[PDB]
Amino acid sequence: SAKSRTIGIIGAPFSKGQPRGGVEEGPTVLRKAGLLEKLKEQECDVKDYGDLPFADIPNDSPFQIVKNPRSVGKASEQLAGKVAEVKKNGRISLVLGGDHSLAIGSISGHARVHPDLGVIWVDAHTDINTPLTTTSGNLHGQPVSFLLKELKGKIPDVPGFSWVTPCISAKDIVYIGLRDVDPGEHYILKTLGIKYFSMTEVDRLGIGKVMEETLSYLLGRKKRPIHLSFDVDGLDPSFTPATGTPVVGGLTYREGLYITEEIYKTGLLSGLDIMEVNPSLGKTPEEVTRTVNTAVAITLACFGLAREGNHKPIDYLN
Amino acid sequence: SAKSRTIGIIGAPFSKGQPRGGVEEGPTVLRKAGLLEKLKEQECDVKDYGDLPFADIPNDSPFQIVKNPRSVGKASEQLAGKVAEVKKNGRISLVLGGDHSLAIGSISGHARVHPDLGVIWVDAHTDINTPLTTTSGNLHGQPVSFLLKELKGKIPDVPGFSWVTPCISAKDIVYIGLRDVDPGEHYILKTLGIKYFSMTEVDRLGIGKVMEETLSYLLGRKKRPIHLSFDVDGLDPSFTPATGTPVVGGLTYREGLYITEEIYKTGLLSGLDIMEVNPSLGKTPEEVTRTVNTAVAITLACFGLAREGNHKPIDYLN
Amino acid sequence: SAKSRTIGIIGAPFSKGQPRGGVEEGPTVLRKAGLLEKLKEQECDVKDYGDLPFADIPNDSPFQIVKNPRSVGKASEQLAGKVAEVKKNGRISLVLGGDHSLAIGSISGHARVHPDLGVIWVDAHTDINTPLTTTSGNLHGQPVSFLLKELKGKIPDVPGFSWVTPCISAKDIVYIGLRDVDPGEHYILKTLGIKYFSMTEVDRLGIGKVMEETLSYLLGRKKRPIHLSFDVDGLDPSFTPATGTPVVGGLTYREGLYITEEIYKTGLLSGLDIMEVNPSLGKTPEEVTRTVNTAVAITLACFGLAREGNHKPIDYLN
Ligand SMILES: N[C@@H](CCCC[B-](O)(O)O)C(=O)O
Ligand SMILES: N[C@@H](CCCC[B-](O)(O)O)C(=O)O
Ligand SMILES: N[C@@H](CCCC[B-](O)(O)O)C(=O)O
Ligand SMILES: [Mn+2]
Ligand SMILES: [Mn+2]
Ligand SMILES: [Mn+2]
Ligand SMILES: [Mn+2]
Ligand SMILES: [Mn+2]
Ligand SMILES: [Mn+2]
Ligand code: NA
Ligand code: NA
Ligand code: NA
């Protein structure tokens, strides 16, 4: 009913931004966990736009060392179109991933409708390698480079990405959670003057101050739509173990909920990505459920579920 | 010897405030863990008033959906009498639970002797459902409603509770740890203007600031006796798993000790409840010991055990 | 190449400061974990001075209740000589322990070259029992007493320690992590006015403020060399389980990295001890690797590995 609780879900069952099979099941496991029902229970208007059908691209040889470029490019192109449709329908886009390369499409599509958007990127990694700085060639570690205006002339013409137009400036993104940043990525971060809170900053300041500073930075001048791109590897693997690039020393479950509670309360959440859940990578069934349950919790916080409690505007004592 | 270390232990082996058998063994396991000996080792004057004999009440059909009302009411009536006796003996009452419905008796009895008492309630839950807002009917989720003066006309005449006189005002209680609050409960919390620190606040402020604010709020105007009612479910289930209503994202072991260290240092601790330890609910024997050991640690902190260390007033270098 | 990254490694495979066999394997497991290679990868100039050969001292009966005094005294004497050699070579000494009694030699040797050094002691314990206050007789719980000038006349003539000259004053050491302090030790701490941050302080202030205060205290007046003596039991046993005197409620992995990141950034790290890793005490092989991996991580942070990332002074986009 409220704008902050009016939602369009998009499943993006896609894995070719990285090597490990299984992340394409993220949308299924999150749905099976009752995500849609649980959103409706907390007074959300929820429309399911379904799972995007990503067509196989059998002929997709590497571009230099960059892997599956055409598949990744097309999946993001399709996703951009669907996100823009959801935004034009007046809904918060909720993308269930799928690997993080999809943020190229998610943010691109969002920005077509709301070009003034600000991005909060919750991740152990900066995901800001270019096709030339990457050493893995995995496109889930490169999405931010494709989106950044300052980097336009450093991105080669990669097959599958001719549709991309960089849509955010270095000032329009804040990182939270960083703890495994490649040297080239660190160079870009410092060269461009991008705002970040690595785990060192979170330890120094506390998540309270991190969020105050994050939101003041993005929203101080003027209010604008927020895009939250949440890689579950941002949280410590003790919370989200079933993911492809875990890094110890992460955000706690509490910190994850704080981040998302605070974002919800701005009333400005406009796009959300819940990325990199890979149920095939749980060592045990409990590791899977633990990961999926945490992802659902984070998502519910984004749409108003508060640890202090919630109530409808009625007299409960009558 | 010191007033803050002069203690009267009361076992309250009672479970009928909630469904799960086993919480009636809390006093046994805590005693078996060496709680009394360990208190004596840290220079406490400890008198054991024994385990209260709660008589079976075979005829105890629900009041509307409220379960075991007469059993719960009588157990709390008996406990109130025993707590008041301990307080008149000049001792800090230490109630070993048993389920949290017993706080009706513990706080009531305490307040008979010290009507100016302030309550700190450490819990994942507010325990403030009335007999009419509850959906579970479990009385361990309702004790605060029976104690609050503002709610007198919203509590029906429940069999077993005719002896109850509400003894605290909304201003005399502070919650710490909240993370699973029912809608009706949240309505009451906001309507009455009760001070609380949900996990969101603890994340925002840090436990340091939470305790400073808690104690300033309760003790700023004037010093008065403190009643600490500690539900072990306030701590994350990674610390206290053997409990009936666990909720993830809880207070850490460190935060639990900080809370209780700070309360100890006021010199004003006057009543303590250590509630909801249920050894039957440990998945493994280690989960039981982990839970019991944490409860003992928390309790020892309440009576002066400090992480920085403790020493007698003698020259240790001579 | 940088002074803060120019290192001399000393293995100290020694266990007789305490009862448990296995801590003498610390240097082996840390080396086997790739510590030296990993230091070189982050642009350190690393010289390996090898493992010290500690000769068996078969005739070493207790001094009162103090155990293996001659063995412990000689091992520290040898280590002092080697540390001083490394310091005269212009390198940061990196002592791989081995039990914490070795800090007598490590700090002594360091202070021969840099008498103005300041010590940061990361530990669950104060390790400041004298031969007369100790109740265990284990010399790993006494090193600080031998080093402190204020305690000279309280240390008896223990066989093996006639070479020791106390080299630090009470003002030159800061403790971080304390949570199991003996009464005599607490007496010494308060009598001498030693700066400490027990876990209570870390909880109160946050590790951010703890480090700011620690470094301001030691370096405010004037810059001087820092000696970090890091007992892995300072970290919670969930992180470093394979150690002889674990105590729950410890520093987190994140807090450990924060401490060492901040120390690195002063440019003043001059001596480092990584102590009490005992692979024989892991309940499982994973507990061993977890402990060793954490120790390596802590060590790499000391020599410039930063969670925000690191890069060489080149243009990565060219
Ligand atoms: N920086 C590494 C890791 C990328 C991790 C990607 B992510 O955050 O989306 O899981 C790479 O370029 O391959
Ligand atoms: N609010 C729920 C849960 C109560 C939990 C009670 B407690 O905190 O004492 O374990 C109920 O009314 O049943
Ligand atoms: N205070 C105890 C414990 C000493 C622990 C030593 B350590 O910190 O180096 O492991 C003793 O004197 O034996
Ligand atoms: Mn990512
Ligand atoms: Mn990542
Ligand atoms: Mn309770
Ligand atoms: Mn509770
Ligand atoms: Mn030590
Ligand atoms: Mn120690
Ligand atoms: Na990831
Ligand atoms: Na409970
Ligand atoms: Na140790």
Author numbering:
A (entry chain A), B (entry chain A), C (entry chain A): 2 to 319
The authors write:
Arginase-1 is abundantly expressed by tumor-infiltrating myeloid cells that promote tumor immunosuppression, which is relieved by inhibition of Arginase-1. Arginase-1 is therefore an attractive target for the development of new drugs for cancer immunotherapy.
Therefore, we prepared and measured two crystals under identical conditions, with the only exception being the pH used during soaking with ABH. Both crystal structures have a high resolution of respectively 1.50 and 1.66 Å at pH 7.0 and 9.0. In addition, the electron density revealed the conformation of the N-terminal residues Ser2, Ala3 and Lys4. We expect that the presence of the purification tag has reduced the flexibility of the N-terminus and allowed visualization of these N-terminal residues of Arginase-1 for the first time. During refinement of the Arginase-1/ABH crystal structure at pH 7.0, we also observed a strong difference density in the Fobs-Fcalc map, consistent with the presence of water, or an ion with a low molecular mass, close to the manganese cluster. The negative charge of the surrounding Asp232 and Asp234 residues as well as the boronate anion of ABH indicated that the ion carried a positive charge. Since the distances to most surrounding atoms were close to the ideal Na-O distance of 2.41 Å, we suspected the presence of a sodium ion. At pH 7.0, the Asp232-Oδ2 atom is strongly coordinated to MnA2+, but has a distance to MnB2+ that is too long to be considered inner-sphere metal coordination.
